[PDB]
Amino acid sequence: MEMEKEFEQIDKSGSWAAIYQDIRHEASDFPCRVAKLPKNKNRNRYRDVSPFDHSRIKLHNDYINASLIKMEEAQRSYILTQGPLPNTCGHFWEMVWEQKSRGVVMLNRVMEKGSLKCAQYWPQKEEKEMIFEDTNLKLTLISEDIKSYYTVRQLELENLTTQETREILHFHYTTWPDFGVPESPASFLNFLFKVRESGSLSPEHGPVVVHCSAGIGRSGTFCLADTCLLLMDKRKDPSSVDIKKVLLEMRKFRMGLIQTADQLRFSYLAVIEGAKFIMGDSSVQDQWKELSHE
Ligand SMILES: COc1ccc(-c2ccccc2)cc1N1CC(=O)NS1(=O)=O
Ligand SMILES: [Cl-]
Ligand SMILES: [Cl-]
Ligand SMILES: [Cl-]
Ligand code: NA
C-alpha cells in the first residue's frame, strides 16, 4: 500500500507536524452564521468550534452543534457533535431520534484534566431514567457490558409524544485522552469493529452519532479510520486509499477534524493494520482482542 510507503517517508524525515499543518492550511472554510448567533452562545461548548451552516444538523430554535459528514464515495454518513451541555441533552437525544441513529459513539470521559468536558447525558442506573421535558423524550439504561477500556450500553429511548420506543447502543471508549491517541492500533480497531458488528453503521439506520468533547479530534480520528477502511473494502485495494485526501474531504463538512499530528499518524497505523482484516486475514481480529486486554 502507498499509505505504508508514505508513512515510512514521513517517519524518516520526521515531518508529521508539517504534513498535519499543510492539511489545516488547505482545510475548507465555510460560514457558521447560525452557530454564532447570540441566542446560540449557550448551545456551544467551545467558542471556536462550530458546525458549518451547509452541513449542520437541524432539530425539527433548530440549532445544535452537530454536522453531517456525508461521505459520498464511501457511502457512509456520520454525525459529529460536541459532548452535550447541561441545557442541550434534550437536543442531543432529539437529534438521535430525528436522525434515526442506532448507535452513539462516545470517545471521551465526562471529566478530563479536572474539567467537565461532557454532561452526564445518559442514565447510570436502570431505576433512574432520565426525562427530557423540553424535547419530550425518556431515556432508560437497560443493560451495560463493561470492559477494561470501553463500555457498551443498551439504552431505550422513548418518544413520549407517540410512545414509540427505540434501542440505542452506546459505545464508550474510556481511555482515549483528550489531544491524545488510543493505547495501540489493536485497542482502537477492537473498539471500531465492536461498533461495526452491532449493525449501527448499516445504511438501513440513520447516521451513527460520534462525539468526544468538541466533536472534532478523537471523533475525527475515529471517522477517518472507519471511512478509509470502508473505501479500501469496497475496492478491495488498500493502495488506492489516500488518507490526507479523505481527511480533507471530511473537513468540508466539519472543521478541525483530527486535532494533532500524532492523531493523524495514529490514523495511518490503524488503517494499515485494519487493512489486514479487510483483505482476508481472519486471525487478526482475535489478535486485536487479545492485545487490547479487554
Ligand atoms: C478536551 O478536548 C478538546 C478541547 C478543546 C478543543 C478545541 C477547542 C477550541 C478550538 C480547537 C479545539 C478540542 C478538544 N478535543 C481534543 C481531542 O482529541 N478531541 S476533542 O475534539 O474533544
Ligand atoms: Cl465518563
Ligand atoms: Cl481528572
Ligand atoms: Cl458539561
Ligand atoms: Na448542501
Method used for this model?
Answer: X-ray
User: CB atoms < 10 A from the CB of 120, how many?
Assistant: 12
Q: Which residues of 42-62 are buried (b: 16+ CB within 10 A; e: fewer)?
A: ebbbeeebbbbeebbbebeee
Q: Which atom of ligand 1 is nearest to the CA of 113?
A: 1
Resolution in A: 2.4
Residue 86: domain span: 1-294
User: CB atoms < 10 A from the CB of 89, how many?
Assistant: 20
Could you say which ligand is closest to the alpha carbon of residue 55? Answer: 5
Amino acid at position 115, single letter: S
CATH of the domain at 191: 3.90.190.10
| Ligand 1 proximity of 259 Cβ (cutoff 6 Å) | yes
| Residue of 212, 219, 224 best suited for mutating to test ligand 1, as the one with most atoms within 8 Å of CB | 212
Q: How many structural domains are present in the chain?
A: 1
| Ligand 1 proximity of 49 Cβ (cutoff 6 Å) | yes
CA distance 63 to 45: 13
Residue 42: phi and psi, rounded to 5, are -75, 5
Q: Residue 236: which region, alpha, beta or left (left: phi > 0; alpha: psi -120 to 50)?
A: left
Which residue's C-alpha comes closest to atom 22 of ligand 1?
Answer: 213
Q: Where are the beta strands (DSSP E) in 59-129?
A: 63-71, 76-81, 103-106, 111-112, 115-116
Q: Which atom of ligand 1 is nearest to the CA of 83?
A: 22
Q: 197: which 3 cell numbers?
A: 458488528
